[PDB]
Protein backbone atom coordinates (compact mmCIF):
# COMPACT_ATOMS: atom_id res chain seq x y z
CA UNK A 1 0.00 0.00 0.00
CA UNK A 2 2.98 2.28 -0.70
CA UNK A 3 1.41 3.70 -3.87
CA UNK A 4 1.52 7.50 -4.00
CA UNK A 5 -2.28 7.64 -4.10
CA UNK A 6 -2.60 5.27 -1.13
CA UNK A 7 -0.19 7.12 1.17
CA UNK A 8 -1.55 10.52 0.12
CA UNK A 9 -5.11 9.37 0.87
CA UNK A 10 -4.01 8.00 4.24
CA UNK A 11 -2.31 11.30 5.07
CA UNK A 12 -5.28 13.47 4.07
CA UNK A 13 -7.95 11.30 5.70
CA UNK A 14 -5.89 10.60 8.84
CA UNK A 15 -6.93 12.16 12.15
CA UNK A 16 -3.29 12.26 13.28
CA UNK A 17 -2.95 15.70 11.68
CA UNK A 18 -3.03 18.60 14.12
CA UNK A 19 -5.98 20.08 12.20
CA UNK A 20 -8.15 17.53 10.42
CA UNK A 21 -8.02 18.02 6.66
CA UNK A 22 -10.54 15.62 5.14
CA UNK A 23 -11.59 15.57 1.50
CA UNK A 24 -13.66 18.73 2.00
CA UNK A 25 -10.44 20.28 3.28
CA UNK A 26 -8.96 19.80 -0.19
CA UNK A 27 -11.14 22.61 -1.55
CA UNK A 28 -11.62 24.35 1.81
CA UNK A 29 -7.97 25.14 2.63
CA UNK A 30 -6.65 26.58 -0.68
CA UNK A 31 -9.78 28.68 -1.20
CA UNK A 32 -9.54 30.31 2.22
CA UNK A 33 -5.79 30.80 1.81
CA UNK A 34 -6.31 32.58 -1.50
CA UNK A 35 -9.12 34.69 -0.04
CA UNK A 36 -7.15 35.75 3.04
CA UNK A 37 -3.95 36.44 1.09
CA UNK A 38 -5.72 38.64 -1.46
CA UNK A 39 -7.73 40.32 1.30
CA UNK A 40 -4.65 41.15 3.38
CA UNK A 41 -2.69 42.42 0.39
CA UNK A 42 -5.58 44.53 -0.94
CA UNK A 43 -6.34 45.98 2.51
CA UNK A 44 -2.69 46.86 3.09
CA UNK A 45 -2.08 48.43 -0.33
CA UNK A 46 -4.44 48.92 -3.28
CA UNK A 47 -5.44 51.82 -5.56
CA UNK A 48 -8.79 53.61 -5.32
CA UNK A 49 -11.79 51.84 -6.85
CA UNK A 50 -14.59 53.35 -8.95
CA UNK A 51 -17.45 51.84 -6.97
CA UNK A 52 -20.13 53.93 -8.70
CA UNK A 53 -18.55 53.74 -12.17
CA UNK A 54 -18.61 57.45 -13.03
CA UNK A 55 -14.86 58.09 -12.68
CA UNK A 56 -14.95 59.13 -9.00
CA UNK A 57 -12.52 56.72 -7.30
CA UNK A 58 -13.04 55.81 -3.65
CA UNK A 59 -9.90 55.24 -1.59
CA UNK A 60 -10.19 52.13 0.58
CA UNK A 61 -6.65 50.82 1.05
CA UNK A 62 -4.83 51.20 4.36
CA UNK A 63 -1.71 52.60 2.69
CA UNK A 64 -3.57 55.40 0.84
CA UNK A 65 -4.31 57.57 3.86
CA UNK A 66 -7.10 55.95 5.86
CA UNK A 67 -7.49 54.14 9.16
CA UNK A 68 -8.35 50.60 10.26
CA UNK A 69 -11.92 51.62 11.08
CA UNK A 70 -12.18 53.23 7.63
CA UNK A 71 -10.04 50.93 5.48
CA UNK A 72 -12.01 48.50 3.35
CA UNK A 73 -11.91 46.47 0.15
CA UNK A 74 -14.22 48.41 -2.16
CA UNK A 75 -16.79 46.19 -3.95
CA UNK A 76 -16.76 45.64 -7.70
CA UNK A 77 -17.43 48.67 -9.88
CA UNK A 78 -21.00 49.37 -10.95
CA UNK A 79 -20.06 49.25 -14.64
CA UNK A 80 -19.28 45.52 -14.65
CA UNK A 81 -22.38 44.43 -12.74
CA UNK A 82 -22.83 40.66 -12.67
CA UNK A 83 -20.25 39.84 -15.36
CA UNK A 84 -17.46 37.47 -14.35
CA UNK A 85 -14.28 39.55 -13.87
CA UNK A 86 -11.10 37.55 -13.21
CA UNK A 87 -7.64 38.92 -13.93
CA UNK A 88 -7.46 37.49 -17.44
CA UNK A 89 -10.65 39.13 -18.74
CA UNK A 90 -9.35 42.51 -17.56
CA UNK A 91 -7.51 44.66 -20.09
CA UNK A 92 -4.64 45.17 -17.63
CA UNK A 93 -3.75 44.68 -13.99
CA UNK A 94 -4.04 48.41 -13.26
CA UNK A 95 -7.47 48.57 -14.91
CA UNK A 96 -8.49 45.39 -13.07
CA UNK A 97 -7.64 47.08 -9.77
CA UNK A 98 -9.28 50.37 -10.73
CA UNK A 99 -12.53 48.52 -11.45
CA UNK A 100 -12.40 46.38 -8.29
CA UNK A 101 -11.77 42.75 -9.20
CA UNK A 102 -10.14 41.60 -5.94
CA UNK A 103 -13.45 41.90 -4.08
CA UNK A 104 -15.03 39.50 -6.57
CA UNK A 105 -12.09 37.11 -6.24
CA UNK A 106 -12.21 37.22 -2.44
CA UNK A 107 -15.97 36.72 -2.22
CA UNK A 108 -16.00 33.76 -4.62
CA UNK A 109 -13.14 31.98 -2.85
CA UNK A 110 -14.63 32.76 0.57
CA UNK A 111 -18.06 31.35 -0.30
CA UNK A 112 -16.49 28.15 -1.63
CA UNK A 113 -14.34 27.88 1.49
CA UNK A 114 -17.20 28.33 3.94
CA UNK A 115 -19.32 25.74 2.14
CA UNK A 116 -16.45 23.24 2.21
CA UNK A 117 -15.93 24.02 5.91
CA UNK A 118 -19.60 23.27 6.58
CA UNK A 119 -19.06 19.94 4.82
CA UNK A 120 -15.97 18.98 6.81
CA UNK A 121 -17.85 19.78 10.02
CA UNK A 122 -20.08 16.82 9.12
CA UNK A 123 -17.29 14.60 7.83
CA UNK A 124 -15.20 14.71 11.01
CA UNK A 125 -18.35 14.25 13.10
CA UNK A 126 -18.97 11.07 11.11
CA UNK A 127 -15.40 9.89 11.74
CA UNK A 128 -15.55 10.28 15.53
CA UNK A 129 -18.95 8.56 15.76
CA UNK A 130 -20.75 11.60 17.19
CA UNK A 131 -24.08 12.68 15.73
CA UNK A 132 -23.84 14.34 12.31
CA UNK A 133 -25.89 17.56 12.36
CA UNK A 134 -23.54 20.16 13.76
CA UNK A 135 -23.32 21.46 10.19
CA UNK A 136 -27.04 22.26 10.30
CA UNK A 137 -26.41 24.60 13.23
CA UNK A 138 -23.59 26.13 11.18
CA UNK A 139 -25.90 26.72 8.20
CA UNK A 140 -27.19 29.95 9.79
CA UNK A 141 -24.06 32.16 9.51
CA UNK A 142 -23.31 30.57 6.14
CA UNK A 143 -26.82 31.44 4.94
CA UNK A 144 -26.45 35.02 6.17
CA UNK A 145 -23.06 35.39 4.48
CA UNK A 146 -24.45 34.04 1.21
CA UNK A 147 -27.41 36.41 1.43
CA UNK A 148 -25.20 39.43 2.11
CA UNK A 149 -22.45 38.71 -0.42
CA UNK A 150 -24.18 36.83 -3.27
CA UNK A 151 -27.98 36.84 -3.23
CA UNK A 152 -28.50 40.57 -2.66
CA UNK A 153 -26.18 41.62 -5.53
CA UNK A 154 -27.98 39.10 -7.75
CA UNK A 155 -31.33 40.65 -6.85
CA UNK A 156 -30.13 44.21 -7.38
CA UNK A 157 -28.34 43.22 -10.60
CA UNK A 158 -24.91 44.59 -9.65
CA UNK A 159 -21.99 43.41 -7.53
CA UNK A 160 -21.39 46.92 -6.16
CA UNK A 161 -24.21 46.34 -3.65
CA UNK A 162 -22.35 43.62 -1.75
CA UNK A 163 -21.18 44.46 1.73
CA UNK A 164 -17.74 46.14 1.58
CA UNK A 165 -15.08 44.08 3.34
CA UNK A 166 -14.51 46.70 6.03
CA UNK A 167 -15.96 48.12 9.21
CA UNK A 168 -16.98 51.60 8.07
CA UNK A 169 -17.96 49.98 4.79
CA UNK A 170 -20.26 47.68 6.75
CA UNK A 171 -21.85 50.67 8.49
CA UNK A 172 -22.31 52.41 5.13
CA UNK A 173 -23.92 49.28 3.70
CA UNK A 174 -26.31 49.00 6.64
CA UNK A 175 -27.30 52.67 6.51
CA UNK A 176 -27.86 52.62 2.74
CA UNK A 177 -29.88 49.41 3.08
CA UNK A 178 -32.09 50.97 5.75
CA UNK A 179 -32.54 53.94 3.41
CA UNK A 180 -33.59 51.87 0.38
CA UNK A 181 -35.62 49.28 2.32
CA UNK A 182 -37.09 49.49 5.82
CA UNK A 183 -34.93 46.72 7.25
CA UNK A 184 -35.80 47.83 10.78
CA UNK A 185 -39.56 47.57 10.13
CA UNK A 186 -39.52 44.05 8.66
CA UNK A 187 -40.74 41.04 10.67
CA UNK A 188 -37.79 38.83 9.68
CA UNK A 189 -35.23 41.34 10.94
CA UNK A 190 -37.37 41.55 14.07
CA UNK A 191 -37.03 37.78 14.43
CA UNK A 192 -33.28 38.12 13.90
CA UNK A 193 -32.98 40.73 16.65
CA UNK A 194 -35.09 38.50 18.88
CA UNK A 195 -32.81 35.56 18.11
CA UNK A 196 -29.64 37.47 18.94
CA UNK A 197 -31.01 38.97 22.16
CA UNK A 198 -32.46 35.63 23.25
CA UNK A 199 -29.18 33.89 22.53
CA UNK A 200 -27.33 36.35 24.74
CA UNK A 201 -29.97 36.02 27.47
CA UNK A 202 -29.96 32.22 27.41
CA UNK A 203 -26.16 32.00 27.35
CA UNK A 204 -25.87 34.31 30.36
CA UNK A 205 -28.64 32.60 32.34
CA UNK A 206 -27.46 29.06 31.59
CA UNK A 207 -23.88 29.92 32.49
CA UNK A 208 -25.00 31.47 35.77
CA UNK A 209 -27.20 28.52 36.73
CA UNK A 210 -24.67 25.83 35.83
CA UNK A 211 -21.66 27.55 37.40
CA UNK A 212 -23.62 28.24 40.59
CA UNK A 213 -24.84 24.64 40.74
CA UNK A 214 -21.29 23.24 40.35
CA UNK A 215 -20.35 23.10 44.03
CA UNK A 216 -18.64 20.36 46.03
CA UNK A 217 -27.11 19.81 42.58
CA UNK A 218 -28.86 20.23 39.23
CA UNK A 219 -32.09 19.69 41.16
CA UNK A 220 -31.20 22.76 43.22
CA UNK A 221 -30.68 24.84 40.06
CA UNK A 222 -33.96 23.58 38.60
CA UNK A 223 -35.77 24.59 41.78
CA UNK A 224 -33.99 27.94 41.73
CA UNK A 225 -35.21 28.69 38.21
CA UNK A 226 -38.71 27.41 38.99
CA UNK A 227 -39.05 29.59 42.08
CA UNK A 228 -37.47 32.71 40.56
CA UNK A 229 -40.15 33.27 37.90
CA UNK A 230 -43.68 31.90 38.17
CA UNK A 231 -42.81 29.28 35.55
CA UNK A 232 -42.24 25.81 37.01
CA UNK A 233 -40.92 22.47 35.77
CA UNK A 234 -39.61 23.17 32.29
CA UNK A 235 -36.36 21.99 30.73
CA UNK A 236 -36.30 19.30 33.39
CA UNK A 237 -33.52 17.46 31.52
CA UNK A 238 -30.28 18.67 29.98
CA UNK A 239 -31.24 17.25 26.57
CA UNK A 240 -34.22 19.53 25.97
CA UNK A 241 -32.47 22.58 27.43
CA UNK A 242 -29.34 22.16 25.32
CA UNK A 243 -31.44 21.55 22.21
CA UNK A 244 -33.47 24.71 22.84
CA UNK A 245 -30.26 26.71 23.31
CA UNK A 246 -29.14 25.71 19.81
CA UNK A 247 -32.62 26.00 18.28
CA UNK A 248 -33.37 29.61 19.21
CA UNK A 249 -30.46 31.57 17.67
CA UNK A 250 -30.17 29.31 14.62
CA UNK A 251 -33.81 29.89 13.66
CA UNK A 252 -33.46 33.61 14.35
CA UNK A 253 -30.49 33.93 12.01
CA UNK A 254 -32.15 31.74 9.38
CA UNK A 255 -35.10 34.13 9.40
CA UNK A 256 -32.98 37.28 9.22
CA UNK A 257 -30.99 35.85 6.29
CA UNK A 258 -34.24 34.95 4.53
CA UNK A 259 -35.49 38.48 5.15
CA UNK A 260 -32.38 39.95 3.55
CA UNK A 261 -32.77 37.66 0.54
CA UNK A 262 -36.46 38.57 0.30
CA UNK A 263 -35.53 42.26 0.21
CA UNK A 264 -33.01 41.44 -2.53
CA UNK A 265 -36.05 41.23 -4.85
CA UNK A 266 -37.60 44.50 -3.63
CA UNK A 267 -40.10 43.19 -1.07
CA UNK A 268 -39.62 45.80 1.62
CA UNK A 269 -40.78 45.87 5.22
CA UNK A 270 -43.97 47.41 6.53
CA UNK A 271 -44.89 50.86 5.20
CA UNK A 272 -47.04 52.65 7.79
CA UNK A 273 -47.19 56.10 6.21
CA UNK A 274 -50.34 58.22 6.56
CA UNK A 275 -51.81 55.28 8.45
CA UNK A 276 -53.60 57.61 10.90
CA UNK A 277 -55.93 60.23 9.40
CA UNK A 278 -58.24 62.54 11.35
CA UNK A 279 -61.61 63.80 10.15
CA UNK A 280 -61.97 65.65 6.82
CA UNK A 281 -58.56 64.44 5.67
CA UNK A 282 -55.44 65.62 7.48
CA UNK A 283 -52.25 63.71 8.28
CA UNK A 284 -51.29 62.99 11.89
CA UNK A 285 -47.63 62.09 12.27
CA UNK A 286 -46.62 58.91 14.09
CA UNK A 287 -43.22 57.45 14.94
CA UNK A 288 -43.26 55.63 11.60
CA UNK A 289 -43.36 59.05 9.92
CA UNK A 290 -40.24 60.28 11.73
CA UNK A 291 -38.57 57.02 10.69
CA UNK A 292 -39.72 57.84 7.15
CA UNK A 293 -38.12 61.29 7.36
CA UNK A 294 -34.84 59.70 8.47
CA UNK A 295 -35.10 57.30 5.53
CA UNK A 296 -35.71 60.27 3.21
CA UNK A 297 -32.54 61.94 4.44
CA UNK A 298 -30.47 58.78 4.06
CA UNK A 299 -31.80 58.04 0.57
CA UNK A 300 -31.46 61.57 -0.78
CA UNK A 301 -27.87 61.84 0.47
CA UNK A 302 -27.14 58.37 -0.94
CA UNK A 303 -27.88 59.30 -4.57
CA UNK A 304 -24.45 60.73 -5.31
CA UNK A 305 -25.28 61.42 -8.96
CA UNK A 306 -28.23 63.52 -10.12
CA UNK B 1 -8.49 -21.81 24.40
CA UNK B 2 -10.82 -19.95 21.98
CA UNK B 3 -9.00 -21.63 19.06
CA UNK B 4 -9.40 -25.18 20.39
CA UNK B 5 -13.10 -24.68 21.35
CA UNK B 6 -14.00 -23.14 17.94
CA UNK B 7 -12.20 -25.87 15.95
CA UNK B 8 -14.17 -28.34 18.11
CA UNK B 9 -17.50 -26.62 17.24
CA UNK B 10 -16.41 -26.63 13.53
CA UNK B 11 -8.55 -0.79 36.83
CA UNK B 12 -6.21 0.92 39.29
CA UNK B 13 -5.35 3.71 36.84
CA UNK B 14 -8.91 3.98 35.48
CA UNK B 15 -10.47 5.41 38.67
CA UNK B 16 -9.11 8.86 37.82
CA UNK B 17 -10.52 8.53 34.30
CA UNK B 18 -13.88 7.44 35.72
CA UNK B 19 -13.18 12.60 35.46
CA UNK B 20 -15.55 11.52 32.70
CA UNK B 21 -18.41 11.69 35.22
CA UNK B 22 -17.50 15.33 35.87
CA UNK B 23 -17.30 16.16 32.17
CA UNK B 24 -13.63 17.15 32.24
CA UNK B 25 -10.73 16.24 29.96
CA UNK B 26 -7.91 16.37 32.51
CA UNK B 27 -4.88 14.08 32.53
CA UNK B 28 -6.25 10.64 33.42
CA UNK B 29 -8.06 10.55 30.09
CA UNK B 30 -4.73 11.20 28.36
CA UNK B 31 -3.14 8.23 30.14
CA UNK B 32 -6.07 5.98 29.22
CA UNK B 33 -5.87 7.15 25.60
CA UNK B 34 -2.15 6.40 25.42
CA UNK B 35 -2.63 2.96 26.99
CA UNK B 36 -5.48 2.12 24.63
CA UNK B 37 -3.49 3.27 21.59
CA UNK B 38 -0.42 1.20 22.46
CA UNK B 39 -2.58 -1.83 23.30
CA UNK B 40 -4.34 -1.48 19.94
CA UNK B 41 -1.02 -1.19 18.12
CA UNK B 42 0.27 -4.38 19.73
CA UNK B 43 -3.08 -6.01 18.93
CA UNK B 44 -2.80 -5.59 15.18
CA UNK B 45 0.94 -6.32 15.31
CA UNK B 46 0.30 -9.74 16.84
CA UNK B 47 -2.65 -10.31 14.51
CA UNK B 48 -0.32 -9.67 11.56
CA UNK B 49 2.33 -12.08 12.83
CA UNK B 50 -0.38 -14.68 13.49
CA UNK B 51 -1.52 -14.24 9.88
CA UNK B 52 2.07 -14.81 8.77
CA UNK B 53 2.18 -17.99 10.85
CA UNK B 54 -1.14 -19.06 9.33
CA UNK B 55 0.01 -18.64 5.73
CA UNK B 56 3.37 -20.30 6.42
CA UNK B 57 1.58 -23.29 7.96
CA UNK B 58 -1.08 -23.46 5.23
CA UNK B 59 1.87 -23.81 2.85
CA UNK B 60 2.61 -26.98 4.86
CA UNK B 61 -0.95 -28.34 4.28
CA UNK B 62 -1.76 -28.40 8.03
CA UNK B 63 -5.21 -26.93 7.50
CA UNK B 64 -6.13 -27.69 11.13
CA UNK B 65 -3.52 -25.27 12.45
CA UNK B 66 -4.38 -22.70 9.79
CA UNK B 67 -8.05 -22.87 10.76
CA UNK B 68 -7.39 -22.50 14.49
CA UNK B 69 -5.05 -19.59 13.76
CA UNK B 70 -7.67 -17.90 11.55
CA UNK B 71 -10.47 -18.36 14.10
CA UNK B 72 -8.11 -16.88 16.70
CA UNK B 73 -7.20 -13.80 14.64
CA UNK B 74 -10.89 -13.01 14.18
CA UNK B 75 -11.35 -13.47 17.94
CA UNK B 76 -9.35 -10.36 18.85
CA UNK B 77 -11.27 -8.13 16.43
CA UNK B 78 -11.86 -4.85 18.33
CA UNK B 79 -15.44 -3.95 19.21
CA UNK B 80 -16.94 -0.80 17.65
CA UNK B 81 -13.99 -0.04 15.37
CA UNK B 82 -14.33 2.80 12.85
CA UNK B 83 -11.50 2.89 10.34
CA UNK B 84 -9.60 5.88 9.04
CA UNK B 85 -11.52 5.78 5.74
CA UNK B 86 -14.84 4.78 7.35
CA UNK B 87 -14.04 1.09 6.91
CA UNK B 88 -15.75 -0.12 10.14
CA UNK B 89 -13.49 -3.21 10.07
CA UNK B 90 -9.73 -3.70 10.16
CA UNK B 91 -8.36 -4.46 6.66
CA UNK B 92 -7.13 -7.92 7.66
CA UNK B 93 -10.61 -8.93 8.87
CA UNK B 94 -11.96 -9.34 5.34
CA UNK B 95 -9.04 -11.33 3.94
CA UNK B 96 -8.62 -13.69 6.90
CA UNK B 97 -12.27 -14.77 6.93
CA UNK B 98 -11.93 -15.39 3.20
CA UNK B 99 -8.96 -17.69 3.80
CA UNK B 100 -10.79 -19.48 6.62
CA UNK B 101 -13.69 -19.84 4.19
CA UNK B 102 -11.21 -21.54 1.87
CA UNK B 103 -9.85 -23.63 4.74
CA UNK B 104 -13.32 -24.80 5.75
CA UNK B 105 -13.69 -26.02 2.17
CA UNK B 106 -10.53 -28.11 2.54
CA UNK B 107 -12.08 -29.60 5.69
CA UNK B 108 -15.23 -30.73 3.81
CA UNK B 109 -17.45 -28.25 5.67
CA UNK B 110 -19.32 -26.58 2.80
CA UNK B 111 -22.37 -25.84 4.96
CA UNK B 112 -20.41 -23.60 7.34
CA UNK B 113 -18.17 -22.36 4.53
CA UNK B 114 -21.30 -20.79 3.02
CA UNK B 115 -21.86 -18.80 6.22
CA UNK B 116 -18.16 -17.92 6.41
CA UNK B 117 -18.20 -16.45 2.90
CA UNK B 118 -21.51 -14.70 3.67
CA UNK B 119 -19.84 -12.99 6.63
CA UNK B 120 -16.88 -12.22 4.35
CA UNK B 121 -19.28 -10.53 1.92
CA UNK B 122 -20.86 -8.52 4.74
CA UNK B 123 -17.45 -7.11 5.70
CA UNK B 124 -17.08 -5.71 2.17
CA UNK B 125 -14.90 -8.25 0.36
CA UNK B 126 -15.81 -6.41 -2.83
CA UNK B 127 -13.59 -8.63 -5.01
CA UNK B 128 -16.07 -10.83 -6.89
CA UNK B 129 -14.05 -12.48 -9.66
CA UNK B 130 -12.06 -15.05 -7.67
CA UNK B 131 -14.99 -16.42 -5.64
CA UNK B 132 -16.69 -17.27 -8.94
CA UNK B 133 -13.51 -18.39 -10.73
CA UNK B 134 -11.25 -19.81 -8.00
CA UNK B 135 -11.01 -23.57 -8.50
CA UNK B 136 -9.82 -24.06 -4.91
CA UNK B 137 -13.32 -23.19 -3.64
CA UNK B 138 -15.00 -25.10 -6.48
CA UNK B 139 -15.81 -27.99 -4.14
CA UNK B 140 -18.14 -25.77 -2.10
CA UNK B 141 -19.32 -23.99 -5.27
CA UNK B 142 -21.41 -27.04 -6.19
CA UNK B 143 -23.88 -26.22 -3.43
CA UNK B 144 -26.79 -24.13 -4.82
CA UNK B 145 -26.84 -21.80 -1.80
CA UNK B 146 -23.37 -20.62 -2.86
CA UNK B 147 -24.84 -19.23 -6.08
CA UNK B 148 -27.90 -17.99 -4.19
CA UNK B 149 -25.80 -15.86 -1.84
CA UNK B 150 -23.58 -14.74 -4.73
CA UNK B 151 -26.70 -13.58 -6.58
CA UNK B 152 -28.22 -11.75 -3.61
CA UNK B 153 -24.85 -10.02 -3.14
CA UNK B 154 -23.92 -9.91 -6.87
CA UNK B 155 -27.12 -9.34 -8.83
CA UNK B 156 -27.07 -9.58 -12.64
CA UNK B 157 -26.88 -6.01 -13.91
CA UNK B 158 -29.16 -6.60 -16.92
CA UNK B 159 -32.23 -8.85 -16.73
CA UNK B 160 -31.66 -10.79 -19.94
CA UNK B 161 -34.48 -13.20 -19.09
CA UNK B 162 -36.96 -10.37 -18.45
CA UNK B 163 -36.09 -8.44 -21.61
CA UNK B 164 -36.28 -11.61 -23.72
CA UNK B 165 -39.66 -12.47 -22.20
CA UNK B 166 -40.97 -8.97 -22.93
CA UNK B 167 -39.65 -9.24 -26.49
CA UNK B 168 -41.57 -12.49 -26.89
CA UNK B 169 -44.78 -10.72 -25.88
CA UNK C 1 -20.01 40.59 23.07
CA UNK C 2 -23.64 40.15 22.05
CA UNK C 3 -22.89 38.35 18.79
CA UNK C 4 -20.27 36.20 20.50
CA UNK C 5 -22.82 35.32 23.17
CA UNK C 6 -25.29 34.15 20.52
CA UNK C 7 -22.47 32.20 18.85
CA UNK C 8 -21.53 30.50 22.13
CA UNK C 9 -25.15 29.64 22.86
CA UNK C 10 -25.63 28.02 19.46
CA UNK C 11 -22.32 26.14 19.51
CA UNK C 12 -22.78 24.83 23.04
CA UNK C 13 -26.31 23.66 22.33
CA UNK C 14 -25.29 21.88 19.13
CA UNK C 15 -22.17 20.32 20.67
CA UNK C 16 -23.93 19.04 23.78
CA UNK C 17 -26.88 17.76 21.75
CA UNK C 18 -24.60 15.95 19.25
CA UNK C 19 -22.32 14.04 21.66
CA UNK C 20 -24.79 12.13 23.83
CA UNK C 21 -24.19 8.71 25.35
CA UNK C 22 -26.48 5.85 24.39
CA UNK C 23 -29.07 4.84 26.97
CA UNK C 24 -24.88 10.15 38.01
CA UNK C 25 -22.69 10.52 34.91
CA UNK C 26 -22.57 13.42 32.48
CA UNK C 27 -24.83 12.64 29.53
CA UNK C 28 -22.47 13.96 26.85
CA UNK C 29 -18.90 12.91 26.05
CA UNK C 30 -16.63 15.81 26.99
CA UNK C 31 -13.54 14.12 25.52
CA UNK C 32 -15.20 13.59 22.14
CA UNK C 33 -16.39 17.20 21.94
CA UNK C 34 -12.98 18.51 22.98
CA UNK C 35 -11.26 16.41 20.30
CA UNK C 36 -13.80 17.48 17.66
CA UNK C 37 -13.56 21.21 18.33
CA UNK C 38 -9.79 21.15 18.89
CA UNK C 39 -9.25 19.49 15.51
CA UNK C 40 -11.71 21.65 13.55
CA UNK C 41 -11.51 25.11 15.08
CA UNK C 42 -8.12 24.66 16.75
CA UNK C 43 -9.00 25.44 20.37
CA UNK C 44 -11.64 23.68 22.46
CA UNK C 45 -12.77 23.83 26.07
CA UNK C 46 -11.39 21.27 28.52
CA UNK C 47 -13.05 22.29 31.82
CA UNK C 48 -16.84 22.37 32.09
CA UNK C 49 -16.88 25.03 34.81
CA UNK C 50 -14.69 27.37 32.77
CA UNK C 51 -16.94 26.95 29.72
CA UNK C 52 -20.16 27.63 31.61
CA UNK C 53 -18.50 30.65 33.24
CA UNK C 54 -17.32 32.00 29.87
CA UNK C 55 -20.90 31.80 28.58
CA UNK C 56 -21.73 34.13 31.49
CA UNK C 57 -18.71 36.41 31.18
CA UNK C 58 -19.23 37.36 27.53
CA UNK C 59 -22.64 39.14 27.45
CA UNK C 60 -22.16 40.88 30.80
CA UNK C 61 -18.90 42.45 29.68
CA UNK C 62 -20.37 43.44 26.32
CA UNK C 63 -23.39 45.20 27.80
CA UNK C 64 -21.37 46.88 30.55
CA UNK C 65 -18.99 48.28 27.95
CA UNK C 66 -21.91 49.51 25.84
CA UNK C 67 -23.31 51.17 28.97
CA UNK C 68 -20.01 52.97 29.51
CA UNK C 69 -20.23 54.15 25.90
CA UNK C 70 -23.74 55.49 26.43
CA UNK C 71 -22.54 57.30 29.56
CA UNK C 72 -19.89 58.88 27.36
CA UNK C 73 -22.60 59.98 24.93
CA UNK C 74 -24.76 61.41 27.73
CA UNK C 75 -22.36 64.38 27.90
CA UNK C 76 -22.02 64.58 24.08
CA UNK C 77 -18.53 63.03 24.32
CA UNK C 78 -18.94 61.22 21.01
CA UNK C 79 -16.32 59.49 18.85
CA UNK C 80 -17.75 61.34 15.87
CA UNK C 81 -14.86 62.47 13.68
CA UNK C 82 -11.33 61.73 12.51
CA UNK C 83 -9.60 65.09 12.18
CA UNK C 84 -6.86 63.86 9.84
CA UNK C 85 -9.27 62.34 7.32
CA UNK C 86 -11.54 65.39 7.46
CA UNK D 1 -41.24 39.40 -6.61
CA UNK D 2 -43.65 37.02 -4.86
CA UNK D 3 -42.60 34.05 -6.98
CA UNK D 4 -38.87 34.70 -6.58
CA UNK D 5 -38.98 35.35 -2.83
CA UNK D 6 -41.27 32.44 -1.97
CA UNK D 7 -39.35 29.93 -4.07
CA UNK D 8 -35.94 31.09 -2.84
CA UNK D 9 -37.09 30.64 0.76
CA UNK D 10 -38.54 27.21 0.01
CA UNK D 11 -35.41 26.11 -1.85
CA UNK D 12 -33.15 27.21 0.99
CA UNK D 13 -35.29 25.42 3.57
CA UNK D 14 -35.34 22.24 1.48
CA UNK D 15 -31.55 22.43 1.15
CA UNK D 16 -31.34 22.57 4.95
CA UNK D 17 -33.65 19.56 4.93
CA UNK D 18 -31.24 17.73 2.64
CA UNK D 19 -28.39 18.44 5.05
CA UNK D 20 -30.35 17.19 8.06
CA UNK D 21 -31.80 14.06 6.47
CA UNK D 22 -28.59 13.06 4.68
CA UNK D 23 -26.61 13.38 7.90
CA UNK D 24 -29.18 11.38 9.84
CA UNK D 25 -29.38 8.66 7.18
CA UNK D 26 -25.61 8.24 6.97
CA UNK D 27 -25.31 8.12 10.76
CA UNK D 28 -28.10 5.54 11.02
CA UNK D 29 -26.49 3.39 8.32
CA UNK D 30 -23.17 3.56 10.16
CA UNK D 31 -25.01 2.46 13.31
CA UNK D 32 -24.15 5.19 15.87
CA UNK D 33 -27.13 7.49 15.26
CA UNK D 34 -28.67 6.72 18.67
CA UNK D 35 -25.54 7.97 20.44
CA UNK D 36 -22.09 6.97 21.61
CA UNK D 37 -21.77 3.48 23.06
CA UNK D 38 -20.17 4.85 26.28
CA UNK D 39 -17.89 1.78 26.33
CA UNK D 40 -15.92 1.90 23.06
CA UNK D 41 -15.65 5.56 22.15
CA UNK D 42 -13.77 5.84 18.82
CA UNK D 43 -11.95 8.88 20.20
CA UNK D 44 -10.53 6.87 23.11
CA UNK D 45 -8.83 4.50 20.64
CA UNK D 46 -6.74 7.48 19.44
CA UNK D 47 -3.61 8.85 21.07
CA UNK D 48 -3.73 12.16 22.96
CA UNK D 49 -3.50 15.16 20.64
CA UNK D 50 -0.55 17.37 21.58
Amino acid sequence: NSSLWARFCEWITSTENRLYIGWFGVIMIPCLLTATSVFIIAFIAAPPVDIDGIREPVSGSLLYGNNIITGAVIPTSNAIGLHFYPIWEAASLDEWLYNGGPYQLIVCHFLLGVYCYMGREWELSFRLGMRPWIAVAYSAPVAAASAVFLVYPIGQGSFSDGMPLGISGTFNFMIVFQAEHNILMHPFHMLGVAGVFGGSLFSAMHGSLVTSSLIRNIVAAHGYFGRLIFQYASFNNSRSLHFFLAAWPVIGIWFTALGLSTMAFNLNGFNFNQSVVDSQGRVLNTWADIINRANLGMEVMHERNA
Amino acid sequence: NFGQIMYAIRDAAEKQWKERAGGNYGAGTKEIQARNYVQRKENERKRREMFDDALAKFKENDIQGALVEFENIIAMEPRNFVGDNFSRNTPIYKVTQYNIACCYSMLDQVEEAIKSLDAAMLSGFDNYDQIRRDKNLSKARANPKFQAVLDKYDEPVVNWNAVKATFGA
Amino acid sequence: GVLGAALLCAIHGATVENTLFEDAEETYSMVTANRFWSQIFGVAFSNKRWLHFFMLLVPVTGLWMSAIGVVGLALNLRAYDFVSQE
Amino acid sequence: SWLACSHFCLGFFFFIGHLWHAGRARAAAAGFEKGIDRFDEPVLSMRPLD
Binding site: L19, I44, L62, N67 | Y25, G26, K30 | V43 | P48, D50
Partner: peptide, 28 residues
Protein backbone atom coordinates in the same frame (compact mmCIF):
# COMPACT_ATOMS: atom_id res chain seq x y z
CA UNK E 1 3.92 56.02 9.53
CA UNK E 2 0.68 55.02 11.23
CA UNK E 3 0.30 52.29 8.60
CA UNK E 4 3.35 50.44 9.94
CA UNK E 5 1.93 50.67 13.46
CA UNK E 6 -1.41 49.22 12.34
CA UNK E 7 0.32 46.41 10.44
CA UNK E 8 2.52 45.61 13.43
CA UNK E 9 -0.54 45.33 15.66
CA UNK E 10 -2.34 43.09 13.15
CA UNK E 11 0.57 40.70 12.55
CA UNK E 12 1.23 40.55 16.28
CA UNK E 13 -2.36 39.50 16.86
CA UNK E 14 -2.10 36.83 14.16
CA UNK E 15 1.07 35.59 15.85
CA UNK E 16 -0.81 35.23 19.13
CA UNK E 17 -3.50 33.23 17.32
CA UNK E 18 -0.89 30.97 15.72
CA UNK E 19 0.82 30.27 19.03
CA UNK E 20 -2.52 29.59 20.72
CA UNK E 21 -3.33 27.04 17.99
CA UNK E 22 -0.15 25.04 17.58
CA UNK E 23 1.66 25.46 20.93
CA UNK E 24 -1.12 24.47 23.33
CA UNK E 25 -0.37 23.54 26.93
CA UNK E 26 -1.32 19.90 27.66
CA UNK E 27 -3.81 20.25 30.52
CA UNK E 28 -2.62 18.96 33.90
Amino acid sequence: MEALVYTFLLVGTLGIIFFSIFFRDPPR
